[PDB]
Design a protein around this ligand. Sequence first.
Ligand code: HEM
Length: 153
Amino acid sequence: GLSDGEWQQVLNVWGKVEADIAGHGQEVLIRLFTGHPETLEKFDKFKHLKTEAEMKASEDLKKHGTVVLTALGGILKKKGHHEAELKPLAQSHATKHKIPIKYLEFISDAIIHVLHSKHPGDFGADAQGAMTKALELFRNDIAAKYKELGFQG
Ligand code: HEM
């Protein structure tokens, strides 16, 4: 788990995201889609986006970014006590959306990238460490739910 100090760092970093949830969410999804085009194919409603310019101009993509980061933020604020929040997300992502855990790794990495991109010099080594642990815990708890379901891809 994370220490109390680590959780405080995570939620301090999260304040940056909360100042511009839509902008952070958009950039995270664009980073995901451009770095890993296979991920776009899981989204019937984003498949039509043929260029990054189109992605940037998509108001629905920004909207989904808000949905994604709002859900993640609610989970992070539980500081690991997130079974009720996380279980349904894991199950919808496995059973309905068919999202391999690899893609959760990709989006976790995208979040770290976007934080540095939007806040260069203001996302310190301790902060990166703590946020990485939180995202690993999130991913790992999802992975346990995936194993329960026998879901791979
Ligand atoms: C931080 C990690 C993620 C969070 C917090 C998150 C959150 C959400 C939420 C709240 C929804 C709407 C409710 C639901 O269907 O459960 C959703 C829908 C969806 N998610 Fe995720 N998600 C994450 C990662 C991913 C990734 C990596 C992919 C694919 C590469 C993905 C694919 C989808 C798809 C296809 C939908 C349905 C979208 C629609 O057509 O409305 N998610 N996600």
